[PDB]
Amino acid sequence: TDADIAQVQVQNKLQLAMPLLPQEVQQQGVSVEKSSSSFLMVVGVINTDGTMTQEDISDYVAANMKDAISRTSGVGDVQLFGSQYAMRIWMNPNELNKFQLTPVDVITAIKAQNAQVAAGQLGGTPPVKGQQLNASIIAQTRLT
Amino acid sequence: MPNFFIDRPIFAWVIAIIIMLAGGLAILKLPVAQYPTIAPPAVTISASYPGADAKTVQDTVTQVIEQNMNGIDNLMYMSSNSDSTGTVQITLTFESGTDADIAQVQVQNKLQLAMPLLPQEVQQQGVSVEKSSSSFLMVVGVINTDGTMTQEDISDYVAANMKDAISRTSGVGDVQLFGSQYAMRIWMNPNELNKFQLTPVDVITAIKAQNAQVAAGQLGGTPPVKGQQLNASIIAQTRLTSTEEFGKILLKVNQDGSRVLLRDVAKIELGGENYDIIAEFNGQPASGLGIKLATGANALDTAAAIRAELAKMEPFFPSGLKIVYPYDTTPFVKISIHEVVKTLVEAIILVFLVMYLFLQNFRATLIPTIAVPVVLLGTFAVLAAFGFSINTLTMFGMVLAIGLLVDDAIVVVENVERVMAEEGLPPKEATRKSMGQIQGALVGIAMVLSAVFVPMAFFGGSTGAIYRQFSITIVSAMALSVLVALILTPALCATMLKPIAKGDHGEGKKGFFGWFNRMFEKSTHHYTDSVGGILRSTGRYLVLYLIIVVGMAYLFVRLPSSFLPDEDQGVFMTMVQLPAGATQERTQKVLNEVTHYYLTKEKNNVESVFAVNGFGFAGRGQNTGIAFVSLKDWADRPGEENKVEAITMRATRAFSQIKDAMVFAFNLPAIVELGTATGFDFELIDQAGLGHEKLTQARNQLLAEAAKHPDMLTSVRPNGLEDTPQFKIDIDQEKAQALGVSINDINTTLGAAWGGSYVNDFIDRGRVKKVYVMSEAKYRMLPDDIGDWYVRAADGQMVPFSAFSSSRWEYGSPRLERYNGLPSMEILGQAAPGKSTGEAMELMEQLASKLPTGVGYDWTGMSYQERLSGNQAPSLYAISLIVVFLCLAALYESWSIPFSVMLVVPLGVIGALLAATFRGLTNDVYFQVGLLTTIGLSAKNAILIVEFAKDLMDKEGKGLIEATLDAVRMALRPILMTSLAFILGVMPLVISTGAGSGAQNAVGTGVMGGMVTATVLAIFFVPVFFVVVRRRFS
Amino acid sequence: GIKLATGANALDTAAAIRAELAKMEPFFPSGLKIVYPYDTTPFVKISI
Amino acid sequence: PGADAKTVQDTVTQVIEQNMNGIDNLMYMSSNSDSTGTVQITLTFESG
Amino acid sequence: ERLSGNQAPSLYAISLIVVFLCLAALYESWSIPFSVMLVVPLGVIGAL
Amino acid sequence: SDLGKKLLEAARAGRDDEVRILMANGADVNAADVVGWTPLHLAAYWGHLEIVEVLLKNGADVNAYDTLGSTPLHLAAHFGHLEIVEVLLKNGADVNAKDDNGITPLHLAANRGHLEIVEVLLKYGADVNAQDKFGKTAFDISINNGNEDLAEILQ
Ligand SMILES: CCCCCCCCCCCCO[C@@H]1O[C@H](CO)[C@@H](O[C@H]2O[C@H](CO)[C@@H](O)[C@H](O)[C@H]2O)[C@H](O)[C@H]1O
Ligand SMILES: CCCCCCCCCCCCO[C@@H]1O[C@H](CO)[C@@H](O[C@H]2O[C@H](CO)[C@@H](O)[C@H](O)[C@H]2O)[C@H](O)[C@H]1O
Ligand SMILES: CCCCCCCCCCCCCCCC(=O)OC[C@H](O)COP(=O)(O)OCCN
């Protein structure tokens, strides 16, 4: 069997199911893979100076190495032995109740204040006659 | 085999007819295009975020897609750019030989799964995955002359009426609309919105409710109450269809009972999806269609069918609407085919004249007239069998073959005519012997010529694809010529030729031919006397050979190199770049001057000017634009003064006077598909998350160090745009929450008004089209207008934007580049006069190593191709040279004698380099293939002299010098006949000034000049080579 | 943990990974080092 | 869902069919749009 | 059905030419093949 | 002017040798792009200390304001150019300069947490109690950003 066509046919049918899946499952990203069950190799990454932690090394591999390896021809699947960094908001239920707030209020605030807004341009098309200025309007950007 | 068909002439005719029918059939079914697939397969992912800046597009779309482009097979590199027009384009280039359909579907599939990660606005607009490596067959222009239609009015008509009909036309493989169909434009007014305490949020909410397709159900639907008689579908609210209906959209009902409609607080009209691009054709409003040729389709049949369909539409066009053809590539294909037929017709005519000049009987002049067309048609059959097409490269490949096809025909017939004239045998017995002398040699020659051209096809990437077109065409033509020489022409010779009396050299005739036969017989004795004297003193001629070999090397190094020659294509471009922050109106004023110049000072050259304001190849924006100049026919532009290069120089110098604008003209590349292909393509990569500002400083450093080496590097500039002033607006979260104004309503009111917002779809005359809400121009121009926009709080009070916002000026990128997922900056440049591109790359690598920590680099495009091609060349030359030796070694039954043949290579190369250097040409593909063919026939001439010379020594027991002198005597006539015919055959190609002359000049110059030396030198040097070699080894 | 794509050559893919890892090493932070604790390809190369 | 034959033809069938251009070995293309809002666009290709 | 009937004449023509050239090659003659190929209508009328 | 546009590019890019040649030929130091940024604005923004001194020697307006009221000191303080801030203040830069928002060099310096520059501004008499359009002081910014070091300096 041609694994390229096998993948195409499997995904063609998966795409009929994708909308019926929960929104949390879609946003984690569903992946279709044509690879062996066993590992070809394991590429380990250590720190001989002990300058970076297990969590620091994992993030660097995920952020600076993993993608390039995943795009290489012959590489069916890549498994990160660790996790890429995320902005972890570790909630306190005592302090949330103290100000009469919930996780719902926290998620609403993050979506509102950690936003990348498309705000248009000064002197944008179609413009008025005699316009001399043309500049991009920059509103809210992602938090860093 | 020659003996087999001498006794069986009808069998020989059957095989010749079978070959002819196969060829005639192949000609009918064969695809026809200007060029074949040269560029490696490339898939471009295109997305759109209305009103978004480069960084918003990159950080929400580009990066998200790039991270999901895994599990895709045979990917070489990935490149992307995100610009301030709200556009992103991710190009994934694949290995040469990769299935473009499998490449696209694998890229498409990974995008589909990454769609839920993209913004809702980007998912609405959608993300296109297209094969971008393909090129246009022609560009159909649609204009309005009576000024009754705008570019939006024209664009909608072409889309609604013409596009699908052209897309359905026979041979059409792709149709891109140069513009957009109508969209329902709501031009909001902030003064009226504030008057009724309304916002863009209310306008969007209302359109979504009152312009919607609502599902209802059925009367008497299943499961029914038994006894039900009628079953009818229920139709509820459907989409709006007109500006009037959108006008009556209700927004608010006041206390007194008065109604607030959408037309009260906005202007409502049909317009374009965006207004970024302004297209003008000779100052008149214009749209158009970019038509691509389908796989295996005939270009000439496709274009004829496109014009045929547009002719049937002509009676249904509104008044003023006209069709124009600013770009069409079929005139090249038609001329390329016509000049091939013309060349090969003149070639057969020229052979006939030379055959009758020497042999002086029509019976002998008809054998080449039959043999040549048979082999040519045979080539078309092999061409079709290997999946090749009729194109410029395959067509000029057959023009370069004729010299080797004609040779086989002459050599066979002439040798029979000689044997009869000398021994006095009947045609049948004469041919049996004549073929017996050359049959083993022609098979040997066939194997050698294979070893020259076949390895050239095993180059990788773009250059390998180009070489393969010439390689297969010449090797096929060469191969069939030998079969026809061992089957047909022997049978023809034995049956068609007339007996010649022993010692009848035509000196007994009168008139011109009686005088000519005496002259030539006297000249042959003069020549054999010269060789006799040359062979008495071989020592000084070996010195004279080394001077040619040193002289060859000298010219070869100093001859400027360039892949393909610049052609007058009847079209060129004029780039128009204005300062940072320059508006659409300012760029139009400059484009109007460019248009005015070309229609005034070049009225006798320029047919039309296609002025495109808003678009550039190096980046987009209001401050960029390109004018596509369409010239008249080449026959209506005599001399070099009325050519693209001349006009290009005049235009560049003329527009130098223009202030606050970088304006200059330049010719298109020989192959539009491939691109520039002159210089290097450098990528400067951020390998350690340094950021944009730090990558700019490292780029400026590399450019500054490149400027300090004018002797090596030239015109080393960035490809992308520079940072521009951008209006940063900070929304105070505390002030917003204090006045009771939500951030969604704030960021919607801003984004919708200033940027535009794609709300939903409506149906215009049975065509689904987009609905856009946006501020009316005059309320979204300057920062003072920001304060005129009001957002309603929870308590119902209208708060101005100034109340909860603060603004400042900062600099940012209007075009952010990324290479292989990481932030990059593309740098272009070329080697200085006299310097090679390879040397220029060595320095660029050295300069790059001294850049700050975390700043990397890589070679892309033509640079990536050149390096992997440069690695293959040595190994292929070696393979090519080893097999040539091994073949000749088997032919002559000697390790030493092959050298005598291989020593003639420089005799043809010197003449080609002398011709090119004198005429001022370059070491291009057409020239390089011209050398390989010149080497081919020069070797072929020598191979027969050495074989005859050796056979006389082996069989008849003649001495070294006796056999050599006897060999050159017998070989003089057929060498002169072949050379005379072939030099005259490529004469039109050299002197050609008109269409496709750059190709013909590169072909003709190297061949003619090479043939002259390869003829004159070889006849004196081949006898020296054989003698000097034979004396040394045994 | 790298798994071989269906049909793809083990040794050719392993070589392509080492080529890509070699392009990263120069731009590593101090102390960071690649190690090879598991590979099935060396056996295939040496066995043949 | 819940769309008549005319509505779904204008918004789906004609939108798909106009993009089914430059497909290799396409002999003919037949499609139907019905009152259940169902669209089926069948593309038949050359033998081989 | 239309395609089958349209290509039928071409098929008969090329089939006859091939059989003729095949005979001409074996018998080393133009006349002997012509003598044989004249027997074709005597068969075709029987099938009809 | 011609040289005015070349100086704007030179000052931004940071080509000291080109700026020198332009000052000799007499390039307009009060030249301004569409947003109202002088060579000094650009030099201050991109952190080109040598060109700031050269421009000021050639009668460049130190208290030049853009179309939104921001001065070279606003930019130098915001992007943390300690050396340029001192040079500007020595040559008579308005330390309490308010933009159209009522933001000062102190506000901007406090926002990005440039402790050295904040103390330089206060040394040259920065109004610590200066309020922007929202009534926010450099101190109100410090406690909101959570900068304990910066908070101590403004007391
Ligand atoms: C008519 C009879 C003639 C038949 C001709 C047959 C054509 C030859 C087939 C091989 C074509 C490909 O040619 C192949 O190129 C690769 C490079 O990609 C070479 O591989 C090369 O690797 C590196 C590249 O830096 C070189 O240092 C090395 O010297 C060389 O081996 C192969 O040695 C060569 O065999
Ligand atoms: C560089 C310009 C292109 C020219 C290419 C070179 C080849 C063509 C040149 C003409 C060849 C004929 O020139 C030939 O020279 C040789 C020189 O040894 C002469 O030979 C001469 O020396 C020998 C002894 O060494 C004598 O026996 C002979 O009587 C004397 O003439 C030939 O008699 C003459 O016919
Ligand atoms: C599109 C189709 C084109 C190709 C079709 C095939 C072409 C066939 C043409 C062949 C006829 C041309 C030659 C004339 C033949 C001809 O006239 O036949 C009589 C001749 O004398 C030759 O036959 P003969 O010498 O008696 O045979 C030997 C007997 N021992």
Residue numbers in the entry:
A (entry chain A): 98 to 241
B (entry chain B): 1 to 1034
C (entry chain A): 290 to 337
D (entry chain C): 50 to 97
E (entry chain C): 866 to 913
F (entry chain D): 12 to 166
Copy the relevant paper text.
Homotrimeric AcrB is comprised of three protomers that cycle interdependently through the loose (L), tight (T), and open (O) conformational states during H+/drug antiport catalysis. Characterisation of resistant E. coli mutants and structural biology analyses indicate that the compounds bind to a unique site on the transmembrane domain of the AcrB L protomer, lined by key catalytic residues involved in proton relay.
In contrast, replacement with a hydrophobic methyl group (5, EC90 = 62 µM) did not impact compound potency, suggesting that hydrophobicity is an important criterion for activity. Computational data confirmed the tendency of one or more inhibitor molecules to persistently reside in a channel linking the cytoplasm and the BDM88832 (8) binding site, as inferred from the crystal structure in the L protomer of AcrB. A persistent interaction between the inhibitor and F948 could rationalize the observed hypersensitive F948A phenotype in comparison to wild-type AcrB. From the crystal co-structure, it is apparent that the pyridylpiperazine EPIs bind uniquely to the L protomer of AcrB. The reason why no pyridylpiperazine was observed in the T protomer may be of technical nature, where the transition from the L to T protomer may not occur in purified AcrB due to the presence of the stabilizing DARPins.
